[PDB]
Amino acid sequence: QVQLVESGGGLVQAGGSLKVSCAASGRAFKTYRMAWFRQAPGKEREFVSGISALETTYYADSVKGRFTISRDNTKNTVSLQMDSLKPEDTAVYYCAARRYGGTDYTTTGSYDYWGQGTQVTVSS
Amino acid sequence: QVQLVESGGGSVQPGESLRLSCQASGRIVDVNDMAWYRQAPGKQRELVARIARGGSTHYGDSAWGRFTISRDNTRNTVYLQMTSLNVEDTAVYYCNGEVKVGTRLSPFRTYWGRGTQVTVSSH
Amino acid sequence: SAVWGISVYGVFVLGFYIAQIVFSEFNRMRLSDWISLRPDNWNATRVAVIIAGYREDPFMFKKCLESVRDSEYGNVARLICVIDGDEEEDLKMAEIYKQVYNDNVKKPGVVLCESENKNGSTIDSDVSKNICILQPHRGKRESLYTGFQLASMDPSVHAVVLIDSDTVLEKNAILEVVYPLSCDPNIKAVAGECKIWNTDTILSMLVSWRYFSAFNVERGAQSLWKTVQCVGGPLGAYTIDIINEIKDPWITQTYGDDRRLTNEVLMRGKKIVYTPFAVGWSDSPTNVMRYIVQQTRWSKSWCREIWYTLGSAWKHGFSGIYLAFECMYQIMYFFLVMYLFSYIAIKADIRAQTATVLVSTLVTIIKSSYLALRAKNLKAFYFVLYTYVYFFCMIPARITAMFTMFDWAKQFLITYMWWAGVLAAGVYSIVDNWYFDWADIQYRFALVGICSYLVFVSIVLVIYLIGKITTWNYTPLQKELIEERYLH
Ligand SMILES: CCCCCCCCCCCCCCCCCC(=O)OC[C@H](COP(=O)(O)OCCN)OC(=O)CCCCCCCCCCCCCCCCC
Ligand SMILES: CC(C)CCC[C@@H](C)[C@H]1CC[C@H]2[C@@H]3CC=C4C[C@@H](OC(=O)CCC(=O)O)CC[C@]4(C)[C@H]3CC[C@]12C
Ligand SMILES: CC(=O)N[C@@H]1[C@@H](O[C@@H]2O[C@H](C(=O)O)[C@@H](O)[C@H](O)[C@H]2O)[C@H](O)[C@@H](CO)O[C@H]1O
Ligand SMILES: O=c1ccn([C@@H]2O[C@H](COP(=O)(O)OP(=O)(O)O)[C@@H](O)[C@H]2O)c(=O)[nH]1
Ligand SMILES: [Mn+2]
Ligand SMILES: [Mn+2]
């Protein structure tokens, strides 16, 4: 099993940059597909970005050219670098992991292991 | 038990033919090779010609252009043709054969003949 | 560094194989040009046929002798049969000779090479009759030495055709080995094609196609430049003069025979060709252990003799550059395969393991396609399985030869070590990449590729099983031999 703890994020004005990294303690951080999801006060959880175990990166329609995801299997940390945090980024970011799955990788039920989330705020 | 008939030679003048024919015995499974050895009243016996079932020929030290050997394997016979004889051809000619008797499993046995006297003299 | 390692391997293998194919085709065209313009019923080179055997199968020995006797060459001097005999058990071969040939067995008390008088007159008096000699057991080289002495004491033999005691010659095999000797006054040796006839087992079939490749492609490519490295044991021809010159150094220097003779001809700066129109049917081992033993011996000889071809290349001028490059290629191919396997095993990446497997399969399929086109046979595609044999029967043999040359026991300890290492590497890769992801396109590629490869290999093996059930795999000579042995 894999236990995920978030780190990073906070209060950044509209236009700045930020980084959120989830650290996953587990047997094999080599075969675990990782993803990030955002929960907004006026919305629900949704897929924003993710990276497979073979370093294939998937990005959401709204954040296709905004964020950058990477993973480090030595220190067991997957990081998301956000640039130009405009509104609608004021959300709690959760890091999710999954070893076995199918073609559906966007629905929250696909990923088995979930984190506690880190809050990110944006002020205009 | 096989025998070689031998056609027979005789006394001939220098410079003619002999036509020495050697015919084998009866019950015979195979004949591999047959040769015409010669024994002079001088120094031991020697080889004149040897012929195989496949037509290969092995001649002696004086047969290269004078004596020829023919098989005609229809009746397991051998023929030796003599040309340009000289006074040194007086000898006894022996027929040599390799014959099977019993069956295919029987070994090839070498057999010799009684021989024929050939004398070349101007008398 | 994975894509470069696989692309370089694929180019380095396939380009050299294609160059060898082109050179082989050019050599075959030249030999066919030589065969044309030859007068009908040609026999000019008087030939002495030499057989050396040691406790041979009676049936195969009889077939070999009868194939020699049925040959359609009209200028054969005699058959010289030399046996490491002098014993009671080795008299069965003499009895077979007597029942196919003359009763002209000779049993001297000494071997010719060990005597102050090495002339053959001490054992031979009639140079006309086919002769059988029962030597004391000393080895293949000594029996070949006696054959050379018996053939060279008749001042009419021009060439010697060396064959084994198990080869079934075709009716024109003798004619097609001694003809190239007459086409170039620098050609002193000729190698004939050896074909495997007992393709009733999977190992035997793969080895038969390996022999087809190694003779009709490698040896043809070598023979285009007239620098054939090894004259095949089952069917070779040597001029009598080169035998006279190179016999003594070859006998006063184990399994390097027919490779050290070729080497002596090469250091003398003389040319050697290979003709594909002379076929001799020999057999192949049907056991993996005996195949590994034979390949260990062959690799010992190869690594012992490769250092002489590399120092004698300059005698050939600029045609020896191909010889040197071939030696360097044979040296580097083993190291490339070892390093590539080690990298793919240690790194343990699925998208690279699958890529390597598929590239190797494609290369072997192309090779087998050419083999089927040349042989006019659909069974040549069985060669796609030979990549297993080389990996599991040839690498341990080469490593054992290397670790014996400069250092069960040694023979059968590196084989199990190599197999255990391969199995451990495979298990490590599977255990390190245990996960399923159908969303990833790369995982889809890897899984689909590996499943397709297993399906293809299973289909080929099932085809082989169906062919073996119906006895469709058997060569026509194999069916004839089965019927004849049943008749006996
Ligand atoms: C002719 C062409 C045909 C083309 C189509 C062929 C079919 C295409 C595929 C069709 C769909 C098949 C999908 C796979 C079915 C088997 C997997 C499965 O059903 O179970 C999933 C399994 C994990 O499941 P589980 O742990 O039980 O999770 C709990 C819920 N059951 O997941 C697994 O355990 C997967 C384990 C397999 C991983 C293999 C990774 C290795 C990939 C190749 C590398 C090895 C190369 C060889 C070794 C070389 C060594 C040098
Ligand atoms: C029980 C399981 C875990 C064992 C796993 C088996 C693999 C570790 C072995 C079996 C077949 C082997 C392959 C068989 C043949 C070759 C050819 C070998 O060298 C060649 O490519 C030369 C042949 C050619 O030119 O195509 C490269 C490694 C490879 C792919 C081998 C890689 C290792 C393989 C996949
Ligand atoms: C077919 C061929 O020519 N193989 C070469 C080897 O020749 C073999 O030599 C042994 C022997 O002990 O004399 C015989 O048992 C085999 O029938 C021969 O094929 C040769 O030894 C080897 C040395 O480099 O290379 C082979 O290509
Ligand atoms: O010490 C020996 C060993 C083998 N031979 C003969 O040389 C050939 C070698 O073939 P082998 O039996 O080793 O099997 P192969 O390598 O052809 O598969 C055979 O005709 C042997 O009878 C020999 O004369 N002396
Ligand atoms: Mn044998
Ligand atoms: Mn053999």
Residue at which a domain ends, from C314, C339, C361: C314
The CA angle C419-C423-C428, to the nearest 5 degrees, is 145
- B31, β-bridge pairs: B99
- The sign of the dihedral angle between the CA atoms of C406, C411, C413, C417 is positive
φ, ψ at C425 (rounded to 5°): -65, -45
**Candidate from C54, C56, C196, C286 with most ligand 4 atoms within 8 A of CB, to mutate:** C54
Minimal Cα–Cα distance from B92 to chain C, Å? Answer: 19
Domain ranges of chain B: 10-120
Considering the domain architecture, whether residues C191 and C112 belong to the same structural domain is answered as: yes
Say if residue C36 is in the same domain as residue C180: yes
* Same domain, residue pair C134 and C283: yes
Burial of B1 (0-12, 13-18, 19+ CB in 10 A): exposed
**For B48, nearest residue in chain C (alpha carbons):** C128
Residues in the 5 Å CB sphere of ion ligand 5: C 166
Residues present in chain A in total: 124
Distance, CA of C394 to chain centre: 14
Of C350, C436, C440, the CB nearest to A100: C436
Q: Where are the alpha helices (DSSP H) in A5-57?
A: none
Residue C130 lies in a domain: yes
The 10 Å Cβ neighbour count of residue C38 is 12
Cβ-based neighbours of C29, under 8 Å, separated by 6 or more? none
CA C224, C227, C229, C234 dihedral sign is positive
State how far Cα C467 lies from the chain centre: 26
Backbone angles phi, psi at B106, to 5 degrees: -70, 145
Q: Are residues C40 and C185 in the same domain?
A: yes
| Chain C residue whose CA is closest to A104 | C439
Cβ(C140) – ligand 4 distance below 6 Å: yes
Chains A and B touch (3+ CB pairs under 8 A): no
Scan for tokens 């008299």, then name that residue.
Answer: C91
Amino acid, res. A99:
R
Strands C131-135 and C105-106: parallel
For chain B, give the number of residues. Answer: 123
Measured in degrees and rounded to the nearest 5, phi and psi for residue C476 equal -55, -40
Interface contact C101-B58, CB threshold 8 A: no
Non-local CB neighbours of C114 within 8 Å, separated by 6+ positions:
none
Q: Of C314, C347, C382, which closes a domain?
A: C314
Give the burial class of C279: count Cβ atoms within 10 A of its Cβ; 0-12 exposed, 13-18 middle, 19 or more buried. Answer: buried
Residues C141 and C285 grouped into a single domain:
yes
Q: Cα–Cα distance between C267 and A37 in angstroms, integer?
A: 76
Q: Which residues pair with C51 in a beta bridge?
A: C81, C163
C270, C327: one domain: no
Domain residue spans of chain A: 3-122
Q: What is the DSSP code string of C273-308? A: EEEEEEEEEE----SHHHHHHHHHHHHHHHHHHHHH
Q: Note whether C309 and C329 are same-domain residues.
A: no
- The CATH H-level superfamily of B10-120 is Immunoglobulins (2.60.40.10)
- The values of phi and psi at residue C126, to 5°, are -110, 120
Give the distance (Å) from ligand 6 centre to CA of residue C166.
Answer: 6
Last residue of a domain, one of C293, C314, C335: C314
The resolution, in Å, is 3.0
Are residues C263 and C163 part of one domain?
Answer: yes
C10 lines ligand 4 (CB under 6 A): no
B30 to chain C: closest CA residue: C100
Has residue C420 been placed in a domain?
Answer: yes
Question: In this structure, what are the phi and psi dihedrals at residue C209, rounded to the nearest 5 degrees?
Answer: -70, -30
C243 and C375 fall within a common domain:
no
- The number of distinct structural domains making up chain C is 2
C-alpha of residue C333 to centroid of ligand 4, in Å: 29
B61: Cβ–Cβ under 8 A, 6 or more apart, which residues?
B46
**C423 Cβ inside 6 Å of ligand 2:** yes
Domain coverage including residue C28: 18-314
* Ion ligand 6 contact residues with beta carbon within 5 A: C 166
Name the CA radius of gyration of chain B, rounded.
15
φ/ψ of A95, rounded to 5, equals -105, 125
Q: Is residue C243 part of a domain?
A: yes
Residue nearest to atom 17 of ligand 3 (CA): C233
H-state helical runs in C406-487: 414-432, 441-469, 476-487
Measured between alpha carbons, how far is B7 from C396 in angstroms, rounded to an integer? 70
Asked if the C-beta of A104 comes within 8 angstroms of chain C's C-beta atoms, the answer is yes
- Which ligand lies nearest to the CA atom of residue C446 in the structure? 1
Rounded to 5 degrees, what are φ and ψ at A89?
-90, -5
Residue C408 lies in a domain: yes
Which residues of B fall within a CB distance of 8 Å from C99?
104-108
Name which of C42, C60, C105 is nearest C79 in CA terms. C105
- Specify whether C251 is located in the same domain as C355: no
Please indicate, yes or no, whether residues C414 and C300 belong to a single structural domain of this protein.
no
Residue C487 maps to a domain: no
User: Which of the following CATH numbers is that of domain A3-122: 3.90.950.20, 3.30.420.10, 2.60.40.10, 3.40.50.20?
Assistant: 2.60.40.10
Residue C261 lies in a domain: yes
Distance of CA A101 to the CA centre of its chain: 18
Distance separating alpha carbons of residues C226 and C274, to the nearest angstrom: 8
C-alpha–C-alpha distance, residues C1 and C185, integer Å: 52
* Minimal-distance CA residue to ligand 4 atom 12: C54
Residues 6+ apart with CB under 8 A from A7: A20, A21, A22, A23, A118
- In this structure, are C308 and C359 located in the same domain? no
Task: Choose among A111, A110, A92: nearest CA to A44.
Answer: A92
Q: Residue C72 class from Cβ within 10 Å (0-12 exposed, 13-18 middle, 19+ buried)? A: middle
CA–CA dist B83, B98 (Å, integer): 27
d(CA C251, CA C261): 10
CA of C359: how far to CAs of C138, C234, C352, C364, in Å? 49, 35, 10, 9
Does C324 show up as a binding residue in the annotation?
no
Contacts 24+ apart (CB under 8 A), B45-51: B45/B94, B47/C126, B47/C128, B48/B80, B48/B93, B49/B80, B50/B96, B50/C128, B50/C129, B51/B78
DSSP C227: B
> Are C437 and A32 in contact (CB < 8 Å)?
no
